[PDB]
Symmetry: C5
Subunit: 282 residues, 5 copies
């Protein structure tokens, strides 16, 4: 059966670890937001979407993680028997689905931004991906939170299945876009995009796995394993992979500048190598 | 007869779904605000008003949606019989009228900003539209919230009628402005404006319809349908259509640059096609 | 006698209307703040003071209106007999005097910024105006709030009289500055300043009138009329007239650019007419 | 004996006046912060420290004054016998010492920034001044707040004496720096610095005087006089004198530009006279 | 044996001093954040990482210190017997470990940013350092907070030992990077980096020492000594040493500009000496 994670009483260790990771995440996102803002003009206007998506995703994550922290502080009470969940502990689990609903479509927008697609294909791509990913999150939220208060095993499973269909649709769309890109890019750029895609699409699998952990039992330790693992995953994907597309966009900006297709006000540096020189509109 | 939406007790599913959409909206607006800010200089000084209106509308929406979220958390209490409305549940419904009062006039300002009107006509247009739209919202607020606490069917209806007159005035003004524009623009620009207008003016109809749903009865289902539908509509219109005028303004900037009427510091890209090159004041 | 406004019990309609206007104001100011910030570089460095004053005034208004909203939510308690003022309701009335104390001197700074005055006269002007206006607000605050808790009719009147002397001093100073300007400006600029002054100085009269309403009796109606009217006045003067000086400053920037006295990085547009072209320091 | 200021019960007038000045200060600082930010690029990179110090000081003041306002609202309760101090009223007095601890060293940094000192002397100057001033504040905090809860007359006095030694050290350092500057500046610049120093160093005396007013007795009148006087002093020194160094820095920037030692992207204006023209790096 | 710091009752002096330092820190960080932001463009794009890391670290510190202040206000209750720790007092100690978890890896990123390393070595360096330092903090958090609620002496010690291994790894990595840099830099730059490294790595020792103070007993004195000393250390290292790398980055920018390897829009000043002139992309 499904044993909802927010039913469990947390040990002190457990409650302490959760607060640590939750706040470390929020602070890492603040740092990431600052970095992304300070470096927004390393990218040409042609790829500004990549930058905006990413800065958006980091802002969203930062706010969502503030809510999660509030929900956590207002969701358990120390009672000699550790910390006992109140009726707002479900909101620690809900807010995360909230956050993914915005953030994951932003990720698709970012990745498509640095691909080589034009016109209808590019608008079709962005429509299907943003749709399929928000649907994928919402189906999850249905199974895990909304129907029967999380407790209906058949709902819980069936909605995860539906969710997995939207997950395959999103991937196919993205994977195809990245692989219609690669023929038109330069070796260095081809490589960079291929690698960014993989990094950006591979760690999605974590989420579905964590989703099904409520099936193996209910414990404060299982709850801590769920909340922590999701927090780490979010930091790795949103923060850790926040520079993959930035490097792609920078190396693309620089190639345009070297081809005389554009100019850029400052030199561009990637891995401490100069990619392009500063130049003025001539 | 009118059954006010804030009278109904919400199931857990219902209360969970509402919080989801409300917060997803707030987070989508934060993302939108960041995008609009990061891309404010893609537009020439001639059309900066379009940008400011839009960035204003997104900032307003973001704050309004924070209030709505507060009002929601402070408006229902879990009581075994789901969530029971308290005396601040009306403020969940009131805050939205508040938000439209600023946001809808901002929308009119934005659309007129990218039209081809000069002098008195342009000042008359903006005066009538900003007036007619704020009046339209306020009449709504009267019928639905203020008179008799929402419960007077004849008020509720009569004020919606008055509201619909201000709605026709606004449309006529706007529609005429857009159609005095189109003769002077270029094919590509003509098309773009025509389409932006339609997108921007068509989904207004949703609001009046939702307004009259408190007449079909009272339920937490119905209450939930109301709050969600309004949230989706807001996201579609404020966020979804936040780029229509931006593209119009960009393509207008670029045409000036190509005509030698202006210069722009960076190249302009629309749908991954280069519209204009960067240039310096010569 | 004086019947203090914060003594009255508010109907539900009344309490609803007040919250509407108060929050609509705050949101309008957020929009205004964003506009003013986004357009700060339409003005040359010579007139940057106008811009800073205005952006300051809008920031102040936005914060003050947040306080007023708090004070309102924490100042009346629903009790079957509508909303009954607690002992913090006075703070709804006090915060507004607070706000004017900063905002009105900012207005004088803004208007003098776009006048044609040099050296001692300009420093004397700004000193007398900023003094006379802050004094004018403080005398008001004395009569209405501080002495006898607002209830002393002779105080209430006598301090309003004193306040009116500082009001005449401020006007004389300002009016003379604007009329020593006009001889040195261009027709187009002369006209623009004259008009901005009138708009900026005419709606001051509202405030003194509203000030003496507590003398015609006490009612929640009267209390509501007071709070709303002040809110509308603030929006009209701070937001509505936030572009008068901006246009003046823009047309002055542009005239310098056309005379070859300065350069400006971007073209300047006023009412959809181009005033000056972009240019580089030569 | 010392009668601590936070022991006194405040009349309604008194409590009203205090809240007025405290919030007027916070709002004035917001305005000042906005001005300083909007005008940060009127100064060359050579004197950017002056700007950063000042913008820092205004940000600090704004936050400190928000705390003081909180502390005030949470420090007295209306009890028929006016407002009666709780055991957090001391924090109204403590927060101010907190604020000076950052702000006064920032002031020294700002003033030294616009002086003509190089190498060791400049690093020695900044070290002694920042040290002596933070020490001066902390000694004050000891005598007034920490030892014996403020109530030890001999502590109170002895720590103020120590504090006055650090005050003389700071002045000597600063005064000497300003007077080793003046021989190397231009008449116009010499004059400007001399005047800025005097303005910046003269109103320090207020603070020590107010410090000893708890020795003349205890009253809500006296308590009110203390809190208001400190608030006015802060506004005069932090806000009122926030442009003295800015003018100094601007006139220094402009002189470099006129000497061909630097360039500046925009013209520089001081008192409505043009000081330097815009120019590009040649 | 370990006597947890959050067990002790604080005298009034003690509670007053702690609040002072905690808030002085937060305010110093706000000032630092403003400085770093205002001066972000003194550094070339090649070394922007240094700037972003530092601005990130200061933003993180500012938020962390706000939490610590909250935790403090909500962690002790005045009970005639001074201030008595409640059960959130542990969170005053926990939040600091939280803060170091982000901030210390940011410090390593900053220092490596201004070193002369390319390709794999630079990516290996940053990976090991960011890992080793976050591990070092987390091991600390285990021993001090999580296991046995802080009270297990053998845990407390053993985890500090493990922590010290990660501390040696981090240092070796960093020290080697800085000393593979120095052969390729200029005298002036070599010197500057060597000095920045020492300053940046030397005051790490404080933290481990303070960590083992809970072993010398329990007291409010000892508790106070701990919290203050950590606060001062943080201010010295995060704020005090926030300019070391900035100077390094500036002098490196300037050397590139003098070599004709880059251009920089503004002149660069270090210690009131001009390092490079402004220039345009040629
Ligand atoms: C914050 C960033 C990311 C990439 C979060 C991703 C979330 C998913 C990939 C969720 C997928 C789900 C599936 C496919 C099936 C079970 C329900 C889930 C929503 C967890
Ligand atoms: C937030 C964006 C938009 C466009 C909101 C629009 C609101 C309306 C178009 C409201 C119209 C009304 C009418 C015409 C009649 C009933 C009362 C309403 C206020 C709902
Ligand atoms: C927020 C903007 C404005 C211009 C507010 C203005 C306030 C006044 C002009 C107040 C004037 C007063 C007078 C002359 C006499 C009675 C007391 C008052 C303060 C209301
Ligand atoms: C916020 C700005 C300023 C300049 C505040 C200044 C504070 C002082 C100059 C304080 C001086 C003190 C002395 C010399 C002796 C008594 C203790 C004091 C801290 C009040
Ligand atoms: C906020 C800035 C800094 C540099 C903080 C540094 C923290 C450490 C160097 C901590 C080291 C530890 C060790 C090596 C052993 C005991 C556990 C500690 C985490 C305190
Ligand atoms: C070939 C280029 C595309 C690779 C993307 C691979 C993503 C895998 C995720 C399941
Ligand atoms: C990947 C992250 C793994 C997190 C594991 C958490 C284990 C918590 C155990 C608590 C008793
Ligand atoms: C008593 C619990 C001790 C171990 C907790 C483990 C915490 C999980 C760490 C995951 C690593 C993140 C990268
Ligand atoms: C080159 C890549 C830069 C940063 C990548 C972060 C990877 C995070 C993985 C965590 C296990
Ligand atoms: C677009 C929003 C769709 C909301 C659907 C809600 C489904 C809830 C079913 C369980 C009760
Ligand atoms: C700026 C663009 C923001 C995109 C946010 C997407 C919101 C959720 C869409 C799917 C449901
Ligand atoms: C630039 C700011 C304009 C905001 C518009 C607010 C409209 C208020 C209600 C109109 C009736
Ligand atoms: C703009 C002016 C706002 C006027 C507000 C009028 C309120 C009328 C409501 C009557 C309800 C009883
Ligand atoms: C000819 C261009 C017309 C643009 C607007 C079309 C109608 C908008 C929606 C009306 C309801
Ligand atoms: C394509 C033009 C039609 C757009 C309809 C938009 C509906 C929005 C509903 C909120
Ligand atoms: C846009 C469409 C949104 C539809 C919302 C439907 C909500 C259904 C709630 C049912 C509760 C029993
Ligand atoms: C070109 C971008 C269009 C915005 C998305 C439209 C949203 C419609 C949702 C149904
Ligand atoms: C530049 C900032 C100035 C703001 C105005 C300060 C308030 C004036 C108080 C006068 C009494
Ligand atoms: C000719 C100059 C006019 C100045 C403005 C007059 C405003 C009067 C308000 C009383
Ligand atoms: C507040 C009321 C403002 C009224 C201002 C009207 C004067 C404009 C004349 C042109
Ligand atoms: C200039 C703005 C005029 C506002 C008038 C407000 C009238 C309030 C209606 C009274 C409510 C109780 C009946
Ligand atoms: C010659 C410059 C002297 C500066 C004097 C500063 C004012 C002294 C206050 C004691
Ligand atoms: C020209 C001398 C200036 C004296 C300023 C005094 C300020 C006192 C308030 C602090
Ligand atoms: C600067 C001078 C401020 C003086 C404040 C006097 C306050 C009197 C309160 C009496 C009750
Ligand atoms: C700026 C000067 C502030 C002076 C404040 C004086 C307060 C007097 C209040 C009289 C109350 C009866
Ligand atoms: C008594 C208060 C003294 C403050 C004066 C501030 C000095 C301003 C510039 C001379 C803004 C235009
Ligand atoms: C940017 C620099 C910030 C300086 C903050 C000053 C803190 C001084 C404390 C001294 C005791
Ligand atoms: C760019 C932001 C990186 C911040 C570092 C995150 C914390 C690392 C934890 C190990
Ligand atoms: C040669 C430069 C060596 C690096 C300086 C830091 C050495 C001191 C660090 C103490 C742990
Ligand atoms: C270095 C910082 C030293 C801090 C010492 C604090 C002493 C507090 C004693 C309280 C009784
Ligand atoms: C900077 C160093 C901090 C100094 C703290 C000393 C605390 C002494 C308190 C005396 C009771």
């Amino acid at each position: 059966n499904v044993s909802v994670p927010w039913g469990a009483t947390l040990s002190n260790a457990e409650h302490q670890l959760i607060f640590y990771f939750l706040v470390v995440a929020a602070l890492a996102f603040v740092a990431g937001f600052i970095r992304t803002y300070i470096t927004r003009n390393e990218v040409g206007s042609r790829y500004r979407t990549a930058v905006s998506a990413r800065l958006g995703m980091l802002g969203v994550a930062l706010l969502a993680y503030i809510l999660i922290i509030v929900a956590f502080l207002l969701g358990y009470d120390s009672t000699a028997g550790g910390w006992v969940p109140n009726d707002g502990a479900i909101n620690i689990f809900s807010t995360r689905y909230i956050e993914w609903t915005v953030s994951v479509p932003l990720l698709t927008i970012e990745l498509l931004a640095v691909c080589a697609t034009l016109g209808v294909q590019a608008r079709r791509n962005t429509a299907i991906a943003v749709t399929a990913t928000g649907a994928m999150i919402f189906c999850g939220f249905l199974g895990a939170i909304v129907i029967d208060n999380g407790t209906n095993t058949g709902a819980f499973i069936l909605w995860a299945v539906i969710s997995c269909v939207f997950w395959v649709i999103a991937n196919v769309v993205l994977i195809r876009a990245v692989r219609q890109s690669l023929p038109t890019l330069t070796p260095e750029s081809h490589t960079m995009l291929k690698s960014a895609a993989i990094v950006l699409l591979a760690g999605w699998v974590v989420y579905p796995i964590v989703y099904f952990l409520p099936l193996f039992g209910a414990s404060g330790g299982l709850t801590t394993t769920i909340l922590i693992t999701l927090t780490v995953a979010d930091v790795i994907v949103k923060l850790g992979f926040s520079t993959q597309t930035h490097r792609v966009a920078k190396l693309r900006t620089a190639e345009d500048v070297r081809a005389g297709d554009d100019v850029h006000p400052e030199s561009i540096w990637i891995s401490s190598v100069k990619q392009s020189d500063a130049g003025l509109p001539r």
